[PDB]
């Protein structure tokens, strides 16, 4: 109808994607793991690798093995079909008070390790 | 991937649909509003009125004017195009401890006023 | 842990609250219904009617009988034991692409009948 | 009021909790990581180990390093303060048609590997 209010659930725009490197014949190096995050981000979002790098803002190869990127919830669903993907999940603050996500910083294709 | 775990959020299978009867020139009676709930539920789900009456579990013509039925989110979306529909919303327990929804109980057309 | 990522579900900051006036002796005028919305909003937020008027942004006395205000989930929860409150639900757009909520527009007590 | 229906978002009772074993000079064996899952579960739920093992239904030391257990959202929030916890999130089906969670099956200390 003209007055219809259809419920619209809230959504998420920060997403964490983990990957499975445990079955590799030869274990990937940390930089090889990050290269694979970049390629998977581009494959899932369907953009250039340079474009995918500007969407990513953090990743880890230690505490966990995954990356974090700005994307819509609809975009996050595109990763369900990809090889090696484990968790697709909204990112949440490790420091809610300071509004900081966890992992190492990833900015402009450059990794900054964080303790 | 084979072990992908996609977070989609949880699903709702109980839906409240409220109706606007404020614009018709002839004000409807209680049983006339309930008859309109049944026909709206049938039209929106694409099923017979006899079947829609089995899906419905509560309604009101006093506290509110609307009805509640078991359906999926994909099904409830289709009510957005029907005349007179106001709110389409996941239903919630009036009495969470006893897992009770609000409104009058509706049992295949037999209606019991909630104390 | 210092690297714990606790899931933070998404939330809602626009809330629709409907009212039951069916039981009352003499049916309320539209202006009386709107005054009831302001008193209820003030009580649920724990503030004055003057302050609550600034939080409201829409209401209806026809299509539905309720008001809409900006508030958090924790604030919306405080309406649950107020007299005559029926539904407490997140507000959603009647026109999603244009980001417009439904009902009549409400700005500090001045209502604009939305055609 | 007696008719108030407060929008209850849907609640989660299946939770995934991952762990950080990356700091240890000598990495933990699979059996040591599983034993650490049981100890974390008991400590986070505030229950005995035997009671905690009853709540657990799946885990991994390979694809990911974590366990999944029945618990309320209020209970999972308590793991945010335990050492070595990384993710706390609601579990989701790897196969939505069969309603099966991922990871190896855990039944009270018995692990059945599932590919």
From Swiss-Prot, chains A, B, C, D:
Disruption phenotype: Embryonic lethality when homozygous. It comes from the Eukaryota. Involved in organellar RNA editing. Required for the processing of numerous RNA editing sites in mitochondria. Binds to the mitochondrial MEF19 and MEF21 factors, two pentatricopeptide repeat-containing proteins involved in RNA editing. This is Multiple organellar RNA editing factor 1, mitochondrial. Homodimer and heterodimer with MORF3. Heterodimers with MORF8/RIP1, MORF4/RIP4 and MORF6/RIP6. Interacts with PCMP-E90/MEF13. Interacts with PCMP-H13/MEF35. The lineage of its organism: Eukaryota, Viridiplantae, Streptophyta, Embryophyta, Tracheophyta. Coiled coil: none annotated. It is found in: Mitochondrion. Belongs to the MORF family.
